[PDB]
Symmetry: C3
Subunit: 148 residues, 3 copies
């Protein structure tokens, strides 16, 4: 089978008092992510992993973040690929993300037209290390498997 | 042909057990085994290590990895391979790589040739480069 | 079939008086990457992903830290060893993270170099360029990082 893998990375600064939107979920918090778009680091990492798996370049080259993810999926399908699964990790010292993971997974699954059982989102802190551990930013990592 | 991929990340502060090998980190804080565990739960879409094994009292990370592998199996997946990287400025890890690989392979019931561990320094950059923490990354491929 | 995945990571310091070589491309810049070889962080990450997928260890095992080695030659040798182990490469994806210089103008040349070295068509190789949004040592321009993923199949 013509399987392909992709990987994505994104990070943004946390600044006052933008909305904190991750995986399409607005999370109550005193700061939010800084970017030209809504700065949804998780959706950006996933988008990059998908463009990467399909050898379609990157988010910079191509481009709210859910609309961008739906367009990415469209472009991946246009190239003849089907998405098999996505896995991801968010690294944030605060706030607590566990209560929001299920809604993120639902949003992603809806945007990629996947069943829930093919989408995973994990949450981590950075153990108080570095800019992530000081709460200066939030990072996301993603992996995607597609097939032509 | 129902393959799935997963990825994992862990870091801990240095105040030493890595890949089950006593060679320290502040669980037993085994960053490599935690990253692998997260990659496996991610491939099976089972969530994450913090949900499955919440702060198991007294359980070491090899035990947690074996329990993860059991849950992945009960979900209907077989593990095909794992790859990983440890980033530590010190000590030297190369002499311990085979022992780590053998521990992981034993816990996952995989042949040695399906398990890989790599080691890197951070070229003196950041908290990793100053010896303040150790990071691990992992990737896993599974099939239903 | 017998698919395997691998992942790679590399970072090098940026310093005056070195060539900046990324993905085999010599990029004009007043600083370059420091290492034993030409310090091509992108090629090194990809090399690590390939050795990882094949369960062949890591770049340090194979090419011990080569003074000024051409990392394209190292990548070609890595690919030869992966093939001798019985694996065929299916795809490579990667990311480069740098505050400066601008890398987007060079991405296509990097992809072409990687594809030629791995005997792959261009549509199986991807390179993505990022900044680190002003955060950390990467945002201060102290070094450049690369990440890679590879899929192989044991023939
Ligand atoms: Zn972003
Ligand atoms: Zn851990
Ligand atoms: Zn290197």
């Amino acid at each position: 089978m013509d399987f392909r893998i992709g990987q994505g990375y994104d990070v943004h600064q946390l600044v006052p008092g933008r909305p904190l939107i991750i995986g399409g979920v607005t999370i109550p918090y005193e700061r939010g992510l800084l970017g030209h778009s809504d700065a949804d680091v998780l959706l950006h990492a996933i988008t990059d992993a998908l463009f990467g798996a399909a050898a379609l370049g990157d988010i910079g080259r191509h481009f709210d973040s859910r609309a961008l993810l739906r367009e990415c999926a469209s472009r991946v399908a246009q190239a003849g690929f089907a998405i098999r699964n996505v896995d991801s990790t968010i690294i944030a010292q605060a706030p607590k993300l566990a209560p929001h993971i299920d809604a993120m997974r639902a949003n992603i699954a809806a945007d990629l037209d996947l069943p829930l059982d093919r989408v995973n989102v994990k949450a981590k802190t950075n153990e108080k290390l570095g800019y992530l551990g000081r709460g200066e930013g939030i990072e996301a990592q993603a992996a995607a498997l597609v097939v032509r």
